[PDB]
Amino acid sequence: GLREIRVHLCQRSPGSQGVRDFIVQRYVELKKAHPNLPILIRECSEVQPKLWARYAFGQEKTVSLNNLSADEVTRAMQNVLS
Amino acid sequence: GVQVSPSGEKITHTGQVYDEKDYRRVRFVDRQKEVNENFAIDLIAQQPVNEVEHRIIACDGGGGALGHPKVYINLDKETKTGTCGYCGLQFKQH
Amino acid sequence: QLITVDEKLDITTLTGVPEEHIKTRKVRIFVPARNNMQSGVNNTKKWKMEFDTRERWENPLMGWASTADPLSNMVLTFSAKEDAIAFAEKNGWSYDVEEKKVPKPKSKSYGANFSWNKRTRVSTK
Amino acid sequence: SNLIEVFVDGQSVMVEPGTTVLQACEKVGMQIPRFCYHERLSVAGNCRMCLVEIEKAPKVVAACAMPVMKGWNILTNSEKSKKAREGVMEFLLANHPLDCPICDQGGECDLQDQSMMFGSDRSRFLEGKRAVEDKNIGPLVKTIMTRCIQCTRCIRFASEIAGVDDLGTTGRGNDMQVGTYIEKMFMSELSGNVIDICPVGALTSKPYAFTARPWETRKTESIDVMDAVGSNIVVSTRTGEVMRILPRMHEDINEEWISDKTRFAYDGLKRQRLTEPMVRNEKGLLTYTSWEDALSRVAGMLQNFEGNAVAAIAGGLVDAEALVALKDLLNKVDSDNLCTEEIFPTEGAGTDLRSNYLLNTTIAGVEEADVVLLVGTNPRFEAPLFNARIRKSWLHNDLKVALIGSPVDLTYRYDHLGDSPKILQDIASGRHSFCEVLKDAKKPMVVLGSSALQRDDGAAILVAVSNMVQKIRVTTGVAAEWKVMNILHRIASQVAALDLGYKPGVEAIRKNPPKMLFLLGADGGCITRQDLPKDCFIVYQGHHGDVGAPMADVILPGAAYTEKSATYVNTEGRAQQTKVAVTPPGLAREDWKIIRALSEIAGITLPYDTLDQVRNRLEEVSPNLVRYDDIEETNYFQQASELAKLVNQEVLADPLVPPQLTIKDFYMTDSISRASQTMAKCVKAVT
Amino acid sequence: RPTVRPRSDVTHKQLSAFGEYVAEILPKYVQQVQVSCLDELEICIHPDGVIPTLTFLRDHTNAQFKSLADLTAVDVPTRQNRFEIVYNLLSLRFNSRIRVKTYADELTPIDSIVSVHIAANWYEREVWDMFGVFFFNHPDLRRILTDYGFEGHPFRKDFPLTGYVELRYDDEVKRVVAEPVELAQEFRKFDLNSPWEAFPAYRQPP
Amino acid sequence: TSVKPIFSRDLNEAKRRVRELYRAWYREVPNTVHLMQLDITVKQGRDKVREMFMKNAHVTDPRVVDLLVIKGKMELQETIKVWKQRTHVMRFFHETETPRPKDFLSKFYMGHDP
Amino acid sequence: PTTNPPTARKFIWTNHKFNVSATPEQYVPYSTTRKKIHEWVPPSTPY
Amino acid sequence: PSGEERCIACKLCEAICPAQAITIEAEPRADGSRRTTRYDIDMTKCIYCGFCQEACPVDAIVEGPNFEFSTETHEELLYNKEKLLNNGDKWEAEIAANIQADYLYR
Amino acid sequence: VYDQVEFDVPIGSRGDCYDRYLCRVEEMRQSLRIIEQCLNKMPPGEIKVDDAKVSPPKRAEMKTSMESLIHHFKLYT
Ligand code: SF4
Ligand code: SF4
Numbered sequence A: 001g002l003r004e005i006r007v008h009l010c011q012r013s014p015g016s017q018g019v020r021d022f023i024v025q026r027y028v029e030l031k032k033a034h035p036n037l038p039i040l041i042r043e044c045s046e047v048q049p050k051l052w053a054r055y056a057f058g059q060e061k062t063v064s065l066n067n068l069s070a071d072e073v074t075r076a077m078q079n080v081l082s
Numbered sequence B: 001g002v003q004v005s006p007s008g009e010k011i012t013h014t015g016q017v018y019d020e021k022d023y024r025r026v027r028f029v030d031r032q033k034e035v036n037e038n039f040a041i042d043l044i045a046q047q048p049v050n051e052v053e054h055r056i057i058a059c060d061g062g063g064g065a066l067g068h069p070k071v072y073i074n075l076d077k078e079t080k081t082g083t084c085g086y087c088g089l090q091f092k093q094h
Numbered sequence C: 001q002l003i004t005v006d007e008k009l010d011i012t013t014l015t016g017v018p019e020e021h022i023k024t025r026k027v028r029i030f031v032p033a034r035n036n037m038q039s040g041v042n043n044t045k046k047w048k049m050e051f052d053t054r055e056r057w058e059n060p061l062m063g064w065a066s067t068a069d070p071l072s073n074m075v076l077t078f079s080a081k082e083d084a085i086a087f088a089e090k091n092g093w094s095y096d097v098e099e100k101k102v103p104k105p106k107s108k109s110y111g112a113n114f115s116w117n118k119r120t121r122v123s124t125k
Numbered sequence D: 001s002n003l004i005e006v007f008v009d010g011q012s013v014m015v016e017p018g019t020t021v022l023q024a025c026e027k028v029g030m031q032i033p034r035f036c037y038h039e040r041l042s043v044a045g046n047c048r049m050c051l052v053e054i055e056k057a058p059k060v061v062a063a064c065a066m067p068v069m070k071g072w073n074i075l076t077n078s079e080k081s082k083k084a085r086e087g088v089m090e091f092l093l094a095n096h097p098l099d100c101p102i103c104d105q106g107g108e109c110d111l112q113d114q115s116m117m118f119g120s121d122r123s124r125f126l127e128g129k130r131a132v133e134d135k136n137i138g139p140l141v142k143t144i145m146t147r148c149i150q151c152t153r154c155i156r157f158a159s160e161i162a163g164v165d166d167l168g169t170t171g172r173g174n175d176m177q178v179g180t181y182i183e184k185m186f187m188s189e190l191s192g193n194v195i196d197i198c199p200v201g202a203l204t205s206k207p208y209a210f211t212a213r214p215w216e217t218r219k220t221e222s223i224d225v226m227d228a229v230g231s232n233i234v235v236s237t238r239t240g241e242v243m244r245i246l247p248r249m250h251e252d253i254n255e256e257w258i259s260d261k262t263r264f265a266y267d268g269l270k271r272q273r274l275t276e277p278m279v280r281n282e283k284g285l286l287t288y289t290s291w292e293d294a295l296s297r298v299a300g301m302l303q304n305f306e307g308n309a310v311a312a313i314a315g316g317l318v319d320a321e322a323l324v325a326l327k328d329l330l331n332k333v334d335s336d337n338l339c340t341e342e343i344f345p346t347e348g349a350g351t352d353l354r355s356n357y358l359l360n361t362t363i364a365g366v367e368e369a370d371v372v373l374l375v376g377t378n379p380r381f382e383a384p385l386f387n388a389r390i391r392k393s394w395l396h397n398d399l400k401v402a403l404i405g406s407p408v409d410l411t412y413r414y415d416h417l418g419d420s421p422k423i424l425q426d427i428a429s430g431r432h433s434f435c436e437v438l439k440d441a442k443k444p445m446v447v448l449g450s451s452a453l454q455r456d457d458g459a460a461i462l463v464a465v466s467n468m469v470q471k472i473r474v475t476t477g478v479a480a481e482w483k484v485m486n487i488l489h490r491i492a493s494q495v496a497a498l499d500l501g502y503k504p505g506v507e508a509i510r511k512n513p514p515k516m517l518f519l520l521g522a523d524g525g526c527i528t529r530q531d532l533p534k535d536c537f538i539v540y541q542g543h544h545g546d547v548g549a550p551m552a553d554v555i556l557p558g559a560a561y562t563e564k565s566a567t568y569v570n571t572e573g574r575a576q577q578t579k580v581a582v583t584p585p586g587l588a589r590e591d592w593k594i595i596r597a598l599s600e601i602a603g604i605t606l607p608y609d610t611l612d613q614v615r616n617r618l619e620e621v622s623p624n625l626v627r628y629d630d631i632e633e634t635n636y637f638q639q640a641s642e643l644a645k646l647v648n649q650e651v652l653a654d655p656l657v658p659p660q661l662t663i664k665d666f667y668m669t670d671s672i673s674r675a676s677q678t679m680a681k682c683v684k685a686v687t
Numbered sequence E: 001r002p003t004v005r006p007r008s009d010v011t012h013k014q015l016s017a018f019g020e021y022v023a024e025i026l027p028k029y030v031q032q033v034q035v036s037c038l039d040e041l042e043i044c045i046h047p048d049g050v051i052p053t054l055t056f057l058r059d060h061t062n063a064q065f066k067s068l069a070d071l072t073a074v075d076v077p078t079r080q081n082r083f084e085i086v087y088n089l090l091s092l093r094f095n096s097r098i099r100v101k102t103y104a105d106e107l108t109p110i111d112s113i114v115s116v117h118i119a120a121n122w123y124e125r126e127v128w129d130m131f132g133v134f135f136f137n138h139p140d141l142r143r144i145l146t147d148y149g150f151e152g153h154p155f156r157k158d159f160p161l162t163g164y165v166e167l168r169y170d171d172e173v174k175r176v177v178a179e180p181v182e183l184a185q186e187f188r189k190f191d192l193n194s195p196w197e198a199f200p201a202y203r204q205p206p
Numbered sequence F: 001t002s003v004k005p006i007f008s009r010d011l012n013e014a015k016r017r018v019r020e021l022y023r024a025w026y027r028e029v030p031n032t033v034h035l036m037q038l039d040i041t042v043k044q045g046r047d048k049v050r051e052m053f054m055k056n057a058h059v060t061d062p063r064v065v066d067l068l069v070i071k072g073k074m075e076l077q078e079t080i081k082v083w084k085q086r087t088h089v090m091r092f093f094h095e096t097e098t099p100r101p102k103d104f105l106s107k108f109y110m111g112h113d114p
Numbered sequence G: 001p002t003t004n005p006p007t008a009r010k011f012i013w014t015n016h017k018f019n020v021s022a023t024p025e026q027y028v029p030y031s032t033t034r035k036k037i038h039e040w041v042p043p044s045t046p047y
Numbered sequence H: 001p002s003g004e005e006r007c008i009a010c011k012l013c014e015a016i017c018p019a020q021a022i023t024i025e026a027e028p029r030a031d032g033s034r035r036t037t038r039y040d041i042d043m044t045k046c047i048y049c050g051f052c053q054e055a056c057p058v059d060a061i062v063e064g065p066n067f068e069f070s071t072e073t074h075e076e077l078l079y080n081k082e083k084l085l086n087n088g089d090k091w092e093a094e095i096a097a098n099i100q101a102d103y104l105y106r
Numbered sequence I: 001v002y003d004q005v006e007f008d009v010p011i012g013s014r015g016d017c018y019d020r021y022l023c024r025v026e027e028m029r030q031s032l033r034i035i036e037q038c039l040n041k042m043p044p045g046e047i048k049v050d051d052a053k054v055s056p057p058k059r060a061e062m063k064t065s066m067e068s069l070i071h072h073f074k075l076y077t
């Protein structure tokens, strides 16, 4: 019972190039598909990108997206959402 | 002047009284509450206003020393008086 | 006759300070802000280390300010953030650090108060 | 590179042209005396105390005003400079009053310190002094005008920053004096900085009158919560009591200024305070009890509730630690209806892109902008220092400023277009006489406040603004490092809630009404018992009892911002933290500690034991809330607008008026400003 | 002038010459010789030159610095070697005084000089008790001014003024027990230092 | 980095100095409860010695260990020679004070103890 | 006094009091400053 | 002479007192004057040095002549504004004369 | 000004308590020898350096002059 997704990423670093690509490519489509889902884009400086996904009764998971490409990031995103 | 509170305690020159529900009233039991009965805020009011023929007047309190620093007060505002911040005296321009 | 010991330095067991006051604390390293009341800057030149404040209650007898923290009036002075932080680590305190907020250089032109075209023109001399 | 070699006691310095002797001395580290000079005001040559000597020159020059020529050598501890300082101090203290033991500017007196350092030790003035009639110019500022040294700092501050033009010098010679020729009152959103700026105790603060002396005060460094700017502040305590509040230089936010409200509302932290846990009686009355009783009862009523029936509402002045704890609790209970008392569109990308609901242009970017556009806002009373930077630009760098909304008294002159929103689409199309400006003007800015989004027509206007921003960006060329769109809040906890994942509004609570409310700092009155079941168990957590506490079932006293270490965030994403100055009164505690212990009791033991752990939780949820003092760029407005363009909602006819029209309403906007018995004096005086 | 202090340069000359003398005899174990405005001679040295230098000054015929007027320590917590150590020495044949300084820290002790001057037997114990600085080759080294169970070095700059513990008699156990410190009037910290520079001659550069 | 040592070259020699000191203490302990009429039992005293030793176990620096050995020797001197008293020795057990409860709740309920 | 009398001023004690270290009219200290923090009192009627 | 107090709450006494024995707390009086609400001295902290009457710019606090004021409790030596004002009213006929004697030396 | 006054220094011969006793006695005597001279040669004039940035000013000057009052305030705070 997923309740929230939150991507944490960086800028001007390789680790987050795939995540920026994902954001430009497929984020509007994801939102319009499931609009009532909270997707929290959160960028900072000198982090290692992660995707914290939070389920119903107070649990959540995470996966490092460092040195990952846009297609792999979309793979992990769909894995989580599924 | 010392005027007593419901509890029977005298009030001070700064309005201090242990609330009737206060446990700190014990220290006064079998004893007293030291209070000064001479209130400056009234003793100075009992004094009259000085009059001067000059729009500026210097106050020191009495003796050159034994008083307070010489301060100069303006008396252009006939609406009210000119008070000294040290001694409390007040002057007028006539 | 020399030895090599590269491990981090600690003197906590020699300072004699106790656990409550060596782990339950939080120290602050900073430059005291200038008092906007005055325009002097001879106080924003040395770094200072202080502690977190704690309970400060009222004595029932006389109304004074009573405490139990013996490090409330403890302020230390340093000439360098590196030395301040080294001392903090040495002693064993978790520290927060602030940067030296220096004012910016400003362009001043007494002539700007009399321009023929600009808004900087002043209405009272 | 257009630089000049100058000498200060022999040492060489590189300085830009137009730079002054004072500035060069400062660049070396030396510091010239001052009475009439201030970095942020115009220059005057009145005090005559900055006088120094130039090698090979008979006359001493004024360091505040003389731009430094090439090759000059400046002698600062020379006999001539020192004799000049001695004479000037002699003259200053000739006619000064001996009021130092009555003068609340006693241990802070620049005149005292400079007389001791650069002045002599005795008087040769055996004549009679003068005295001056003392004015009355408000309830905040006390005027003893026989201490004015005629420096003009007040006049200049007023004319330039506060845009008032009501102070001045009437008369000439020693008979001259400062103030208003009449009994006018000086009541501005910025009146109160003349106090810090007056080098002497001629202008003082009536509240702080006679209460303390500087060498007694302990000084902590904290931030404001009254507004959403985050003005850096100093809290000066004495024996565990808050005595006053001062500014603190942050040249990217406030630059030595703060607002009347946040410098004279420290009295509200001493009245109508919650000191003990309270609970409903059997007679419906509120009565005192202990933390054990209250927390156990709340946890009991929590163990029999979940989902949409449990809800949380947060008002202004609440801390991100408390927010994240309440979320990490109501999420283990599976009630995600965590809401704010202030609103932001839930449509479009809403709270999903930080590029939104922010001042994407740094508050300092107004000093580089060219055109500014204001939508439904009185920034003069909401975030006044934003208006202050706007006027600073309007003065120095010839800024253009326009306002869509009601006719308002901005401290400066502005272009007025109309009170209705349709001008937005009008502009975007091109049937307006403002496209002409926007076309020739680069670096534009368009800022919109939450006071217009509080309407029902909240998202339509915002989407119109977004489309207009796109059209402007494509018409007048701009890079992707210059930002255009900006959102401005009146609330200090908003950005934190939105970055922690709250629902910006109360629509969810009006949709699926709850049976168990956690209301925290919600002294607004938006929600009440006319919107809930007859048996809603409600827990009020807060530091004042104003609106939401009486209509409560359990009350848990908490700690204000002068009594806790806690993060807040301003309209530009700058995370800042307070520092405890005075421990809370009595049984009051910290909100995150309260919620943690509550969960431990219920059986939902959280993993947060210390503030560092709570901050690491904040880091995991959003990693920006621990990079204090640092803003973080954003680059996803194209996607934001791509999405927001698909949101059909029509605007309405009624204009968009600001709720704060006159200074009468700047005061009394939060529970602290309602508790302050000085803000009441100011309101009364205004009316 | 009647309000200012006289100023004799003969002493400055003598002491600068003797500084050069001492420094060229001991180019090792020596650094930062300085004679001040008020005509006092300081010689800073390395912790390995204590006994060499003290012996030289005591025995050398030109020096005869026999009396150990004082031994002291000084805590400056902003320098890696935070414990300055100071020996104030006196010579009667010349009616002269001198200062010999070295440095130390925690874990980095100094060599004892009871072999040279026996007065130090107690001064060094006092330094160890107050600033926490060990000395090598000291017969007895133990608490001298503080209580027997005192844990701390209180003349440092980080040790609080009022301390960490407090004593009182308790009838239950019939002894003088120790406890944490709870005062009925917290000592007040007066912030006095002025914002305006008072001595330019010491103005540090930025 | 490189340093100058004190009374040791490595933690092994340091630990054997420590073990000699423990021998001395452990052996002397009962003579104290005998000379000065302490109420406690030798078991309590020895447990206290063990506790005060393990309180400084994480230590790694030979110098920080040699200094602790020095100070323990000072204390043992003060104790075997009757310079300390019943009071100074019983100042180790804290018989007249309750400790700060190691419970978030037991702290919260009474004070701001973090 | 007989030859050099004092200055006749009111607010000066006419009747002298001796040491009262233990008498019932002795000195008991207290704080002269009023309450600082005023609490919140709710009304005496529910909802 | 009017009967008005002299202390204007300037705190120089509190700032110079070596033993930190003077606690002061002031306010504006209903008649608009600088006057104290609280003035406490601890005789178990005073070293009797006179710096307070050296500093007072108005001759309001004076270390008088009396020395026979021993007690039986430690709580009768914590003075306050009331006790000190009573002592002033008590001993003014002597303090004034001694000050008239000595004020030309200071 | 000890350089302006005469007195003898008693020295011993054996380093014993008796010699030190006699030394202290003769010191008590040389003290009278010095006091006679100090009295006879007492000069007039001020008593504290007239540098009001170190030593406070007199009270009349404090209560009539601005600079003296500022110096008093700063010196006692
Ligand atoms: S401003 Fe006030 S403190 Fe400063 S010299 Fe004037 S009277 Fe004294
Ligand atoms: S009132 Fe104060 S700020 Fe204004 S001119 Fe006078 S001294 Fe300057």
Ligand code: SF4
Binding pocket: H013, H016, H017, H018, H019, H021, H022, H041, H045, H046, H047, H048, H049, H050, H051, H052, H053, H063
């Ligand atoms: S005489 Fe007593 S009260 Fe006055 S300053 Fe000296 S120690 Fe303080």
Ligand code: SF4
Binding pocket: H006, H007, H008, H009, H010, H011, H012, H013, H014, H024, H052, H055, H056, H057, H058, H060, H061
């Ligand atoms: S007693 Fe004198 S020095 Fe002390 S605060 Fe009152 S007036 Fe100032």
Ligand code: FES
Binding pocket: D033, D034, D035, D036, D037, D044, D045, D046, D047, D048, D049, D050, D051, D062, D063, D064, D065
């Ligand atoms: S600072 Fe130059 S004349 Fe005032």
Ligand SMILES: [Zn+2]
Binding pocket: B059, B060, B061, B068, B084, B085, B086, B087, B088, B089
């Ligand atoms: Zn007067």
